[PDB]
Amino acid sequence: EIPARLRTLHNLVIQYASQGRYEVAVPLCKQALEDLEKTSGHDHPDVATMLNILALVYRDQNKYKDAANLLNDALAIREKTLGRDHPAVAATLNNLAVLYGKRGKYKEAEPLCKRALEIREKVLGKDHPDVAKQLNNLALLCQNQGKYEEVEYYYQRALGIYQTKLGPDDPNVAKTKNNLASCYLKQGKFKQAETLYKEILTRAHEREFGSVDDENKPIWMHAEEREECKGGWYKACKSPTVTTTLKNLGALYRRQGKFEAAETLEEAAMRSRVFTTEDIYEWDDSAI
Amino acid sequence: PARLRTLHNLVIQYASQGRYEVAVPLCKQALEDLEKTSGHDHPDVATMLNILALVYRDQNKYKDAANLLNDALAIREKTLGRDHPAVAATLNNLAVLYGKRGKYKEAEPLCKRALEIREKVLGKDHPDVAKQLNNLALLCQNQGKYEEVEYYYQRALGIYQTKLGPDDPNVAKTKNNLASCYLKQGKFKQAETLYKEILTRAHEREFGSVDDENKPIWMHAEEREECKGKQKDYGGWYKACKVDSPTVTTTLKNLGALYRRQGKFEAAETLEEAAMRSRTVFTTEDIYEWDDSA
């Protein structure tokens, strides 16, 4: 009847972790690990799953060091039980890379992210949107090492996959363009970053109001006009990425001394809820 | 004057960044200097009042936000007329502010006036009228007027489904709001049905038609439950961001809670596992729509 106990413990861990009640989930999770090791030993895929669940919880508590320890343990187990090149191994590698990345340990993060990419290319193909998502994380790790030539290549590759496979109007496209614009900002390539921000806002405008003409322009065209002369409530639902684009383009206008252009974009940012450059790593949820 | 231009510029700069400790004082300074220069009850004064109200709203200073919007409403009524879109936005936002403070008796007439204005300008079957009906439904829900609440949601749901797609985000949100109303009344089976409609439609949109090999999570969940004895013991990572909608996470959690209440613990585990990867106690948070046009 120990397996019945484990069934109930797993059920409770999931229940209380879904509710964000970590004061309950963490102890029950540790209890499940203790009881699993007695039955199935340490080198069983279910032990690696429970380790991933505890790592997720620690990640939300910003206990990145502790989360990393559990995922290191889980990676070793999964390699030995499921094979290297198993999708569960790619997810663990990605999440370890992000954990190291959050701690600024980029030298240690890069090889893990690269191995995850190898696995995803082998299983899904080199032109799969999940490969584009992994390239974003790799690009971010390389960006913090100053490897800008590599960073630009990975983003351009990812951007190509997304635009061919998914719409030009896909959220992954705007997010990737933002990440690339941040890379350009760190290099002092302000005009290249400005172009990406404008592409994002122009496309968002065309999606809601159709073609651009003299009578129907995007916010940034109104902004630049303003500088030279110193029933759509339901459509609100159709992005945090857009507010970051507005803020960053606003900052670029301010740096050029175009304060009226900046005011127009920043006013739009206020209504839609020092460049806003936060490294945003994608987490693989399929580690389970 | 140049001083006002610079003050307005800074208020906007620091409010964009969420730096309210700077924006509020500069905003008050701009209002002081604006009233000296230009007449009070000028539309520019109403705009600066709206900006300060926005800031106070994010600081949960609902009473103070309401004072500024009452002042702004008076100015806009007198300058733009009682049936102007900007007046409808201010009325809606006042109603939400009163609503957040639990003053629902005071909120309902303001929300109703906004609805009247939107119906008059846009027509009785316009999606903006459906959005206003959601807010009215929520104010009535907290007064316990469930008969009115169900009618307004059903009306809104009809507008959205006829005018926009059945796949529109407004449809899933409205179905959730109605399910919450059913949960408060103890109408658990009606709420279960709406949650399933939401997840079935969300599944069809992202993974295509339903068959034996391709089912929504709730069908996998109910299978798992019937096959407790029988149970023996693929990369859509890109889909997560789009299909990891907050309304979908709420539906997973709430349907999971409903399964747990029926004693179907394996069904609940399936939906709650999905909710973890997306991110009797239920998630029933009042979500008022704010009119940003104001």
Automatic annotation (TrEMBL), chain A:
Keyword entries, A-Z: Coiled coil, Cytoplasm, Cytoskeleton, Microtubule, Motor protein, Repeat, TPR repeat
TPR repeats: 90-123
One CC-aspect GO term: kinesin complex
Annotated localization: Cytoplasm, Cytoskeleton
UniProt record, GO biological process: axo-dendritic transport
Family: Belongs to the kinesin light chain family.
Assembly with partners or alone: Oligomeric complex composed of two heavy chains and two light chains.
Functional summary from the UniProt entry: Kinesin is a microtubule-associated force-producing protein that play a role in organelle transport.
Name listed for the protein in its UniProt record: Kinesin light chain
Organism: Mus musculus
High-level lineage: Eukaryota, Metazoa, Chordata, Craniata, Vertebrata
From-to range in the entire protein, with total length: 208 to 494 of 542
